[PDB]
Design a protein around this ligand. Sequence first.
Ligand code: CLA
Ligand code: CLA
Ligand code: CLA
Ligand code: CLA
Ligand SMILES: CC1=C(/C=C/C(C)=C/C=C/C(C)=C/C=C/C=C(C)/C=C/C=C(C)/C=C/C2=C(C)CCCC2(C)C)C(C)(C)CCC1
Ligand SMILES: CC1=C(/C=C/C(C)=C/C=C/C(C)=C/C=C/C=C(C)/C=C/C=C(C)/C=C/C2=C(C)CCCC2(C)C)C(C)(C)CCC1
Ligand SMILES: CC1=C(/C=C/C(C)=C\C=C/C(C)=C\C=C/C=C(C)/C=C/C=C(C)/C=C/C2=C(C)CCCC2(C)C)C(C)(C)CCC1
Ligand SMILES: CC1=C(/C=C/C(C)=C\C=C\C(C)=C\C=C\C=C(C)\C=C\C=C(C)\C=C\C2=C(C)CCCC2(C)C)C(C)(C)CCC1
Ligand SMILES: CC1=C(/C=C/C(C)=C\C=C\C(C)=C\C=C\C=C(C)\C=C\C=C(C)\C=C\C2=C(C)CCCC2(C)C)C(C)(C)CCC1
Ligand code: SF4
Ligand code: SF4
Lengths: 134, 80, 166, 154, 31, 31
Amino acid sequence: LSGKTPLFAGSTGGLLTKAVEEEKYAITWTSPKAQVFELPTGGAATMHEGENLLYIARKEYGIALGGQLRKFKITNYKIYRILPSGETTFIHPADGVFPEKVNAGREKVRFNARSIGENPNPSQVKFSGKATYD
Amino acid sequence: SHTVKIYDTCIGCTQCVRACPTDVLEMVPWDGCKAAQVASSPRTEDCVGCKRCETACPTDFLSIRVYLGAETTRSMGLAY
Amino acid sequence: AQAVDASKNLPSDPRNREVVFPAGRDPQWGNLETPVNASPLVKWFINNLPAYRPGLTPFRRGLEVGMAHGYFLFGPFAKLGPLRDAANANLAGLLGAIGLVVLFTLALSLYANSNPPTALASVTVPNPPDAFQSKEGWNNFASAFLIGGIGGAVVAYFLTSNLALI
Amino acid sequence: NREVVFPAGRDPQWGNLETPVNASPLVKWFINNLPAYRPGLTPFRRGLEVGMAHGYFLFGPFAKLGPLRDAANANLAGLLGAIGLVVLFTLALSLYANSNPPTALASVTVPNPPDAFQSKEGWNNFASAFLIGGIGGAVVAYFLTSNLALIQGL
Amino acid sequence: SSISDTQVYIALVVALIPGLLAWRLATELYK
Amino acid sequence: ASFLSSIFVPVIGWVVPIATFSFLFLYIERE
Ligand code: CLA
Ligand code: CLA
Ligand code: CLA
Ligand code: CLA
Ligand SMILES: CC1=C(/C=C/C(C)=C/C=C/C(C)=C/C=C/C=C(C)/C=C/C=C(C)/C=C/C2=C(C)CCCC2(C)C)C(C)(C)CCC1
Ligand SMILES: CC1=C(/C=C/C(C)=C/C=C/C(C)=C/C=C/C=C(C)/C=C/C=C(C)/C=C/C2=C(C)CCCC2(C)C)C(C)(C)CCC1
Ligand SMILES: CC1=C(/C=C/C(C)=C\C=C/C(C)=C\C=C/C=C(C)/C=C/C=C(C)/C=C/C2=C(C)CCCC2(C)C)C(C)(C)CCC1
Ligand SMILES: CC1=C(/C=C/C(C)=C\C=C\C(C)=C\C=C\C=C(C)\C=C\C=C(C)\C=C\C2=C(C)CCCC2(C)C)C(C)(C)CCC1
Ligand SMILES: CC1=C(/C=C/C(C)=C\C=C\C(C)=C\C=C\C=C(C)\C=C\C=C(C)\C=C\C2=C(C)CCCC2(C)C)C(C)(C)CCC1
Ligand code: SF4
Ligand code: SF4
């Protein structure tokens, strides 16, 4: 991960020991202009001209931030998952296309060909380990 | 963790993917003739259960349903 | 004309000097370096307290801690406890103070016998404290707390009861 | 009813025999979590807990049954007499320690090895703690017994 | 006016028998 | 016979809670 941290003096709302112990996420993006943007947790910061990087405690802070950057007309936002052993993964746009738009490589996951109304009654499914929504 | 189940009555609004904060959802194509768009729940580990997807679903009743279950650090939204 | 209006927005101006800083050099961390948190006076005091002092054994840390607390906890039971207006008032303080020390030692052993999670690092003390990150270190700390705790309370008992002769 | 007694482990060749007194859940918990066998303790802390138990123990027989029983200095004799045993008990440990001990041993009630008692340093640190805790336990029992009328007097 | 002492001591000794079986009953259920 | 209450009451108020909470706390934290 390569990028400049946005300039802000610091804030109590931010990374805690859970970042070092369990996992921390990091959001990266590129800007045309240096502007002011509200951080995900308190305060304001001055994003640099290009290749900005920010470490966030949760994934929700990044996508929430990504929506704000879209209002500044920035859609090249990328999120990573950093584990304590240094492992990094391309999490949010696993495929390069955004989730809203379609791609052929994707496949159905947890699809029910029936309707919710046609779910089995739970009395038919008890003492078996099965749930109705399967 | 939680389980997001998506049923046959999807029509391809894509609104569920937008309202989601955690990117648990993704729009995939259908081999069928219905449309080139179906909602999916590929990464359910990040599902927190905020039911924003169920607020953006314009069906007679929910095509996409969120069933709560076992909890984790991620599903509880704990930054500590 | 401008007594101070011209002076603002200058680095030489005394107002513009900043006392608060990001934790370490990474602002993304939680804490903030402040005079209370990161001053040399507070850093020296906290880092050289028995829990954080360099090059001490876990037993010697608890003895310093227990001797303090044992000598402290005698006071509330004696003057403000029951039978405070009786001849044996100071005696009740010695027993009650040692009672908390036992419960305090019991709590240490329980937190010890439960595999403790970690000992954390902060701005006031950058290094980790000591070998309190293990089941063995906390146990030795508990045995030391009980010895100092009973000793400190006896010391407070002897001085206060024998204060008139002193 | 089921069979209670069984061979030690899977080997019947070995001497040990699993029995209720030997290999019950209650006894295995108590013995294995005693200070000599408790997990996650240092050799020093094991001896202190042991000596503190024995020091507080040995005060009684001297005072209540020794000479000067029916005297004013009866309880004092129990404290001094008890400390004499802890010193001799500490000496016995140091001699058994300074002489190369053979080893500790495992049994059914304590399957894993006991602790780092397989060296001179393990027993010597045990001995130093025995004298400290042993003198402490006897001193405690002296003040309680001598001032028991006061504590009840409260 | 009150039960004798030896009677009261007996009732406590008898009380161990329900307590013992109660402990054995409970540990059986947890399995 | 009234000396039983002097021994039993503090046992119920202090000893039994300490033994139960100490056992339960360590038990719920095992792995
Ligand atoms: C009528 C009351 C009653 C009964 C019969 C049971 C029965 C049971 N409970 Mg239960 N429970 C109850 C009330 C009751 N519960 C209440 C009010 C709560 C609070 C919400 C719970 C909370 C609870 C939990 C959280 C769990 C159970 C579980 C269980 C099962 C295992 C045995 C057990 O309780 O652990 C025995 C507990 C012990 C601490 C062991 C010691 C035995 C008793 C308590 C003490 C007796 C010793 C005595 C005082 C000393 C004198 C004798 C001495 C001389 C030897 C069993 C089906 C467990 C389970 O999963 O079920 C399958 C479990 O995890 N219970
Ligand atoms: C249900 C059981 C129970 C029992 C038997 C007691 C008994 C007692 N409590 Mg108590 N308490 C209880 C529950 C109980 N508490 C609970 C649940 C609470 C929470 C609300 C409290 C809150 C409470 C307060 C806030 C205070 C007491 C105090 C006292 C003592 C006052 C006696 C007196 O008249 O003046 C004093 C008469 C004396 C003869 C002097 C007593 C000296 C102490 C008790 C000697 C203790 C030595 C001890 C065993 C050492 C422990 C180490 C050992 C474990 C190895 C008495 C021993 C008072 C006290 O100060 O006690 C010192 C007091 O201030 N209790
Ligand atoms: C309600 C809590 C309380 C009570 C009742 C006491 C009571 C007592 N403390 Mg004490 N103390 C306390 C809290 C308390 N302290 C705290 C919080 C600390 C740590 C900051 C200390 C540290 C301390 C030390 C280091 C010493 C005492 C001593 C004494 C005894 C003085 C002798 C006497 O009887 O004169 C008559 C007493 C009174 C009429 C009332 C109390 C007056 C004392 C002097 C108050 C001192 C504490 C101070 C004001 C706390 C503020 C700290 C805060 C700014 C951080 C007395 C029994 C001394 C001792 O053992 O006696 C030989 C001693 O050497 N205390
Ligand atoms: C002959 C050996 C002997 C003698 C003389 C004593 C004497 C004493 N013990 Mg003691 N004790 C013994 C063996 C002995 N014990 C054994 C073998 C153990 C371990 C099982 C203990 C564990 C023990 C504890 C845990 C405590 C004492 C305490 C006391 C004192 C009670 C106060 C008093 O004087 O009341 C008057 C006493 C008497 C008139 C006669 C002695 C009566 C005691 C209560 C008998 C207890 C021992 C028992 C009968 C031995 C068989 C145990 C076996 C089933 C394992 C007293 C000095 C208490 C103490 O320090 O006092 C404050 C205390 O807290 N003892
Ligand atoms: C000013 C200031 C302050 C204050 C301080 C204080 C107030 C102090 C404390 C105090 C204390 C808290 C003290 C204590 C002390 C104690 C002691 C002095 C102890 C003693 C001990 C002893 C001596 C013991 C011994 C023994 C043993 C151990 C065992 C056996 C027995 C015997 C007894 C021998 C502070 C820091 C806050 C802040 C800053 C400033
Ligand atoms: C029922 C039962 C039983 C019984 C039991 C018994 C009877 C017990 C014993 C008892 C004992 C045997 C006890 C002892 C204890 C002791 C103590 C209580 C101690 C004390 C200590 C101290 C406190 C000290 C401290 C110190 C020090 C260390 C140093 C300085 C000084 C001082 C003092 C501070 C048995 C197990 C057999 C079996 C099973 C069942
Ligand atoms: C201390 C002492 C004494 C006494 C002792 C005795 C003899 C006692 C007995 C008594 C006892 C110690 C008792 C206990 C109790 C018992 C019981 C009887 C319990 C149990 C019950 C039950 C019935 C339970 C229930 C349950 C179940 C079943 C299940 C679940 C859980 C529950 C808990 C709910 C004497 C004076 C000698 C001497 C001095 C010291
Ligand atoms: C310095 C410091 C701090 C702070 C602190 C404070 C500011 C406070 C504390 C507080 C506390 C922590 C308190 C405590 C208290 C307690 C009490 C209040 C108790 C009492 C008790 C009693 C009353 C009892 C008695 C008894 C016994 C023991 C036994 C026998 C019986 C009787 C009941 C007698 C911290 C943590 C941040 C950190 C470290 C350092
Ligand atoms: C528990 C147990 C057991 C058992 C045991 C028994 C059952 C018994 C023993 C026994 C014994 C082991 C005994 C001892 C005794 C001793 C004596 C009897 C001594 C005495 C001495 C004296 C009397 C002296 C004194 C003195 C001194 C010390 C110094 C100075 C001088 C004089 C002379 C003063 C066993 C081992 C298996 C294991 C572990 C646990
Ligand atoms: S009906 Fe619901 S799940 Fe289907 S496309 Fe519309 S918002 Fe998405
Ligand atoms: S409940 Fe929340 S995380 Fe789950 S699908 Fe709906 S919006 Fe997404």
